[PDB]
Amino acid sequence: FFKTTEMIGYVHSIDGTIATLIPAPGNPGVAYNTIIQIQVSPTTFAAGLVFNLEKDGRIGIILMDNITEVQSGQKVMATGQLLHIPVGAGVLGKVVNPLGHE
Amino acid sequence: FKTTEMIGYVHSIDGTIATLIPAPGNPGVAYNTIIQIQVSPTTFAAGLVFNLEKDGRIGIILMDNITEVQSGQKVMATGQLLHIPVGAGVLGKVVNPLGHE
Amino acid sequence: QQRTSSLYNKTRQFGITAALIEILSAMSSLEGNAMKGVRRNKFWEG
Amino acid sequence: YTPPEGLKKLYASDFENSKYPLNIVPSDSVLFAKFLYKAAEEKGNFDNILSDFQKIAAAASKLPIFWERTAVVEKIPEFKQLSEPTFFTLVWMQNNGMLELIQEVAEVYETFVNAKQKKAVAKIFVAPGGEKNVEE
């Protein structure tokens, strides 16, 4: 009865709007083109998209939000799902981001 | 130029550029300084430091006696930037960028 | 004729340079992304 | 350096393709850690390697900054007390110039040991100085 996420590794390097991740040994691993959450704080997360899966195990991440909050050594959780956004007649007349945030 | 201590040995030579592998203990070389490669026991060629690599390798731009430079030769560090003679004692003379007449 | 010839000779020079730079930027990337693995040899035997 | 015969024989084998408790993706550190695990498995003792890493970590705290780039494990007296497998690996790294991976090869080796011994480690992340209470 816990909201258990799926930690897959840590943040190794940051170059502007992209990042790289090193997987912790013996972890489930992340899937290609999936969304991941970088724990910038015990309650705040930054969205990233998987772009590369290298032989070394390193993962290429495209950051989407809260980039300034991202630092090397932070934890990363894997949602294990592709990108889904709100859709319906309730969004008409509104300004939104690609992530669906109004 | 006044030498202080050896700071490594010549490793590679690609035309007018060169690389230096560190001497034991990695004494270190200040960036953008002038170094003296012991091409001969009494002759030292001039080089300019332009890169300090993480491994300890130094990037050198050779200035003169490039042909004489060979891999394995010792390199000494002046510890100072390039300084050249200036004043009325140089007027009417022909010099090179290193200050040699 | 003297103004369009210069633009033609200036264009071919730029075209050659842009291509070779572009090829040699995709050669650097391939080399940079690649690296030499752990050297498995008798290091002690030296 | 005069490595022992057992390590020499193993170092020439394709141990990288052998079976291991876990299937970790190949890496620079992982090859180093697999070698230690394979060598220790033959003797059956794994805690010796862990002690060696502990000594290395303690010794490194006193070494000068950037000691991994001027490192000579043979001349360093702190590493003279290490086991043959660990000492061989350190020399092997110093030859590859990857002595900065010491703190990561150890993590992989511990993971293999825990998997082999059937131990599950739970990381408890706590605030600095807040580790006093861990009952929950």
Side-chain angles (χ1 to χ4, degrees):
Chain A
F1 56 97
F2 298 145
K3 299 181 179 181
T4 63
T5 62
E6 188 181 8
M7 180 172 175
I8 52 76
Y10 305 84
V11 179
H12 186 243
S13 63
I14 311 177
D15 188 352
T17 178
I18 63 86
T20 308
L21 310 184
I22 44 173
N27 283 32
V30 65
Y32 188 81
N33 198 22
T34 53
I35 297 289
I36 56 84
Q37 300 293 351
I38 302 172
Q39 189 185 26
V40 302
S41 82
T43 180
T44 311
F45 299 91
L49 183 68
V50 178
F51 196 73
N52 294 343
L53 298 177
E54 303 175 8
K55 181 179 182 179
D56 303 2
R58 293 185 180 178
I59 301 157
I61 298 300
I62 300 162
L63 307 177
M64 302 294 181
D65 60 69
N66 296 328
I67 292 172
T68 61
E69 304 294 349
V70 187
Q71 306 176 18
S72 188
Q74 295 182 343
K75 306 182 185 64
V76 183
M77 315 303 177
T79 61
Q81 303 177 14
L82 303 175
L83 182 61
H84 298 58
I85 60 173
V87 300
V91 184
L92 301 174
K94 298 181 179 178
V95 182
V96 297
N97 291 9
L99 298 179
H101 301 165
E102 300 184 5
Chain B
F1 304 91
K2 299 178 182 178
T3 59
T4 64
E5 57 178 357
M6 182 175 64
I7 54 75
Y9 306 89
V10 181
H11 180 57
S12 65
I13 305 176
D14 183 5
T16 178
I17 57 168
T19 308
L20 309 185
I21 53 169
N26 298 24
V29 182
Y31 180 78
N32 201 30
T33 52
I34 297 294
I35 58 82
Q36 297 295 328
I37 307 182
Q38 190 172 50
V39 297
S40 201
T42 177
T43 313
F44 300 85
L48 182 71
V49 179
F50 82 95
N51 175 23
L52 302 176
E53 295 184 11
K54 191 153 179 162
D55 199 329
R57 298 185 179 184
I58 300 90
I60 299 301
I61 306 177
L62 311 175
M63 314 308 295
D64 46 354
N65 300 4
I66 300 184
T67 60
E68 313 183 4
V69 183
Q70 303 171 218
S71 63
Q73 299 175 348
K74 298 176 177 180
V75 183
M76 289 64 179
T78 64
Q80 299 179 355
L81 303 174
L82 180 59
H83 291 70
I84 55 175
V86 296
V90 188
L91 299 178
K93 297 184 177 180
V94 184
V95 296
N96 62 342
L98 295 177
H100 302 346
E101 300 181 359
Chain C
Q1 283 173 217
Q2 288 193 298
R3 186 230 291 162
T4 60
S5 67
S6 298
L7 298 165
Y8 166 83
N9 278 332
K10 213 176 168 179
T11 293
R12 64 164 273 276
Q13 290 183 11
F14 295 158
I16 299 163
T17 312
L20 200 31
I21 287 172
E22 169 177 316
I23 300 156
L24 297 168
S25 293
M27 195 177 61
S28 287
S29 180
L30 294 178
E31 297 164 337
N33 312 344
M35 280 314 308
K36 50 191 173 178
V38 189
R39 320 210 314 199
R40 284 267 301 276
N41 73 80
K42 302 188 172 62
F43 49 89
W44 64 90
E45 182 178 358
Chain D
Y1 187 31
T2 59
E5 303 179 5
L7 296 181
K8 288 179 173 177
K9 184 176 181 180
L10 172 56
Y11 174 73
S13 316
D14 292 67
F15 69 95
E16 191 184 12
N17 299 329
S18 300
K19 297 183 180 181
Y20 298 89
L22 301 178
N23 301 330
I24 298 177
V25 68
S27 185
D28 268 325
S29 57
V30 157
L31 181 77
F32 287 110
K34 286 180 173 180
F35 179 88
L36 291 173
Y37 176 87
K38 194 68 174 180
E41 188 177 358
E42 299 182 358
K43 300 181 179 180
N45 187 332
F46 301 97
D47 300 2
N48 297 330
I49 285 68
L50 301 178
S51 301
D52 300 329
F53 289 141
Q54 293 291 359
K55 297 177 179 179
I56 291 168
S61 180
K62 300 182 178 182
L63 296 177
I65 54 183
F66 300 159
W67 65 269
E68 300 115 332
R69 323 186 189 179
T70 101
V72 189
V73 298
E74 301 177 351
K75 301 177 181 178
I76 293 169
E78 300 293 354
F79 304 154
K80 183 60 175 181
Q81 306 299 347
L82 306 175
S83 305
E84 297 177 352
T86 302
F87 188 90
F88 179 88
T89 306
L90 292 176
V91 181
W92 185 22
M93 287 190 200
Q94 186 274 358
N95 164 258
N96 301 292
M98 314 203 231
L99 277 171
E100 304 241 22
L101 309 179
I102 287 170
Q103 298 281 326
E104 298 176 359
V105 169
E107 182 181 4
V108 177
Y109 183 87
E110 294 178 5
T111 303
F112 281 144
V113 168
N114 300 11
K116 184 61 175 60
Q117 298 181 354
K118 298 181 178 181
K119 300 181 178 178
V121 177
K123 296 180 180 180
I124 306 173
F125 306 93
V126 294
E131 61 183 357
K132 305 177 181 180
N133 298 332
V134 301
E135 60 186 2
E136 298 183 357

